[PDB]
Design a binder for this molecule. Structure first.
Ligand SMILES: O=c1ccn([C@@H]2O[C@H](COP(=O)(O)OP(=O)(O)O)[C@@H](O)[C@H]2O)c(=O)[nH]1
Ligand SMILES: OC[C@H]1O[C@@H](O)[C@H](O)[C@@H](O)[C@@H]1O
Ligand SMILES: [Mg+2]
Length: 452
């Protein structure tokens, strides 16, 4: 079967970084007979920035598709994306299989460079191909390059299996290879690699018989495998892919980062999100992992807003940044206090301060950021991304201009989640285990444990 002539990249969360966009543009330009698609999730993305990103991509002749619009976002994937700090590596690992099942084509990470164009037609004996190359290494297994024909049954089986693997992620034991991975790499990386990444893929290919008894996790031995599953039907290094020695991969998913806009949501919105997420965990696995949710919800970073003018309705205890009316104008930052009153924040002079204390000044570094903006009337998606990042973490030395971020503590939140979930008789009955270390709650968990 022929590999469908589409090259798929995924970027969920905030807007794809400029470096990755450049990588995608190079793929698109070197492979003009292929449709290049970037996949996004409009449900968690910041709307204005995504709209500007999409327009940019259209101007460049890159298609942008939304995972929900196209129907490739399984409820399991929605579950991870709606977390306050999603694991975008897990998300992408799952989306790539669903996308390929639906459309066919070639999935590629945005941290792989194009060394040579693909053939005009790629023909796959079993409708599915992997690369023996990944991240600068030959004779290896990875999930960052995957080719299939639309509707391929191997890819469909992998998509179904990865859902099951993901659903069972709390049950992941760090034994065998993953014992040591946990130790060196951290639980987050080890778990990601084993539940949705190349460790998952290894085990699944072994179970399906695609990899035989000679293949091991640390030594895939493609030269002893059925090479009809490989691009070009060979273990030889493909012509198509390149990375620099000094950056074999980005590891962009490793940091745990709040998804866009969490700091601007109400407590009630965030609480209801946690409840819905907990309900899914309970219905699918019977596990109520209370502390995960309470520990996300306890985080309140600065609320903020970038506008053209002062609104009717302001958010108490927030930053309000006002764009210049003309490219030569000045920006105005206000701290909106807890009584919804505007407090003009003074942005310090960028040129005239050579003292190390002034260089470190949060407000001077902010003004310098604003000063680098190309057209302040019409900031780009990436400029808005960086301004928004600065405002989330802006902590002035002046207390009068510092957000308060008064918020419930972890344990109080956990108590509220406990009550909300267990007061639903249906969910309460579906709980098999609850993980909490909160002293007020460990006993409420025992008392339910025995009720059953
Ligand atoms: O904020 C982020 C970070 C990562 N990713 C996804 O995670 C994938 C893997 O990231 P990367 O290639 O940097 O990881 P590595 O290959 O180094 O494990 C990317 O291709 C994206 O699809 C994402 O959607 N949003
Ligand atoms: O599983 C997390 C990450 O693992 C890496 O080995 C792959 O190159 C990525 O595409 C994947 O997202
Ligand atoms: Mg990568």
């Amino acid at each position: 079967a022929q590999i469908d002539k589409k090259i798929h990249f995924i970027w969920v969360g905030h807007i794809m970084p400029q470096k990755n966009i450049q990588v995608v543009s190079e793929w698109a330009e070197k492979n003009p007979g292929y449709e290049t698609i970037i996949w996004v999730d409009k449900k968690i993305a910041p709307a204005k920035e995504l709209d500007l990103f999409i327009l940019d991509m259209k101007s460049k002749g890159i298609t942008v598709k939304d995972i929900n619009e196209e129907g490739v976002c399984r409820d399991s994937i929605r579950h991870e994306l709606d977390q306050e700090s999603p694991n975008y590596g897990m998300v992408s690992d799952m989306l790539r299989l669903n996308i390929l099942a639906a459309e066919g084509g070639i999935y590629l990470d945005s941290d792989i460079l194009c060394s040579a164009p693909f053939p005009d037609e790629i023909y796959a004996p079993f409708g599915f191909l992997l690369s023996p190359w990944s991240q600068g290494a030959n004779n290896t297994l990875c999930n960052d390059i995957i080719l299939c024909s639309k509707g391929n049954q191997i890819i469909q089986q992998l998509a179904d299996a990865i859902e099951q693997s993901y659903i069972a992620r709390d049950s992941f034991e760090f034994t065998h290879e993953y014992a040591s991975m946990k130790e060196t790499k951290g639980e987050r990386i080890a778990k990601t690699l084993g539940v949705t990444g190349p460790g998952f893929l290894f085990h699944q290919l072994k179970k399906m018989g695609i990899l035989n008894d000679k293949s091991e996790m640390e030594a895939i031995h493609w030269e002893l495998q059925d090479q009809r599953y490989l691009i070009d039907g060979s273990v030889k290094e493909p012509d198509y892919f390149y990375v620099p020695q000094n950056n074999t991969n980005d590891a962009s998913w490793v940091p745990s980062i709040k998804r866009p806009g969490i700091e601007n949501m109400s407590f009630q919105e965030r609480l209801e999100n946690a409840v819905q997420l907990i309900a899914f965990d309970i219905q699918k696995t019977g596990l109520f992992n209370l502390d995960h949710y309470a520990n996300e919800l306890k985080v309140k970073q600065n609320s903020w807003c970038i506008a053209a003018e002062t609104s009717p309705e302001l958010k108490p205890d927030s930053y309000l940044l006002i764009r210049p009316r003309d490219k030569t104008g000045e920006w105005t930052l206000y701290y909106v206090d807890e009584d919804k009153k505007l407090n003009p924040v003074t942005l310090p002079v960028i040129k005239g301060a050579i003292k190390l204390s002034e260089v470190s000044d949060p407000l001077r570094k902010f003004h310098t950021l604003l000063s680098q903006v190309s057209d302040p009337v019409n900031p780009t998606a990436h400029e808005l991304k960086q301004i928004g990042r600065a405002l989330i973490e802006l902590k002035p030395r002046q207390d009068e201009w510092h957000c308060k971020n008064k918020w419930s503590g972890a344990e109080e939140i956990a108590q509220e989640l406990w009550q909300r979930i267990t007061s639903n008789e249906t969910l309460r009955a579906q709980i098999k285990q609850c993980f909490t270390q909160f002293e007020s709650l460990k006993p409420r968990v025992a008392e339910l444990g025995l009720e059953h």
